[PDB]
């Protein structure tokens, strides 16, 4: 703050800026997927598919 | 019970010590005034002299500009026992008590 005081007056009150944090968490969850293919299907679909 | 402030806008309590009265127009017509006012020159004050000064500037900023105070100080000067104007200033004191 910058207030108005007289010339032959005392000093004003104290004043100083302020800074603030953010904290924004990154450990809660996980986007995932599964598909579970067999072991014969990966062999027979190398000839059955054009 | 009075809350007077010096009536010029940005020059209320000067650090130079010379409070300059703004020019004002006194008969409601025709005359300019142009005063100044020097502060503490033979001491400072004894807490009555902050209050008499509080009314000297009141009778000088607001009263001589006014068009009804000057008519009431005119009607004192038309009294039938008011001559040699040190009896003029003592006849309005008996009014003001």
């Amino acid at each position: 703050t910058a207030t108005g005081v007289a010339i032959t007056g005392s000093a004003p009150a104290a004043s100083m800026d302020a800074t603030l944090p953010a904290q924004l968490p990154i450990s809660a969850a996980s986007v995932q997927s599964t598909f579970t293919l067999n072991l014969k299907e990966i062999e027979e679909s190398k000839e059955q598919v054009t | 019970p009075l809350v007077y402030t010096p009536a010029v806008r940005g020059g209320a309590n000067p650090a130079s010590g010379s409070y300059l009265l703004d020019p004002q127009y006194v008969n409601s017509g025709v005359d300019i005034l142009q005063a100044t006012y020097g502060y503490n020159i033979n001491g400072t004050a004894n807490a009555d002299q902050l209050l008499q000064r509080d009314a000297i500037l009141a009778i000088l900023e607001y009263a001589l500009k006014d068009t009804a105070f000057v008519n009431a100080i005119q009607a004192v000067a038309a009294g039938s026992g008011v001559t040699t104007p040190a009896s003029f200033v003592s006849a309005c004191v008996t009014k003001l008590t």
């Binding site: 800074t19 944090p21 | 020059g11 000067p14 010379s18 300059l20």
Partner: protein, 49 residues
């Protein structure tokens, strides 16, 4: 992590962002001057002839 559970430290990034409008735009074009005197006195002319 029970070991590294209370021996953690906060290591704020170098990303301070200013979020205030301290702009003196009209003061920046008024053609400033010094004045070491009590008060400026100039004279305005009306007329009346």
């Amino acid at each position: 992590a029970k070991l590294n559970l209370a021996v953690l430290n906060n290591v704020f990034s170098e990303l301070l962002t200013q979020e205030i409008n301290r702009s003196a735009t009209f003061l920046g074009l008024l053609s400033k001057y010094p004045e070491r005197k009590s008060n400026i006195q100039w004279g305005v002319g009306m007329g009346g002839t």
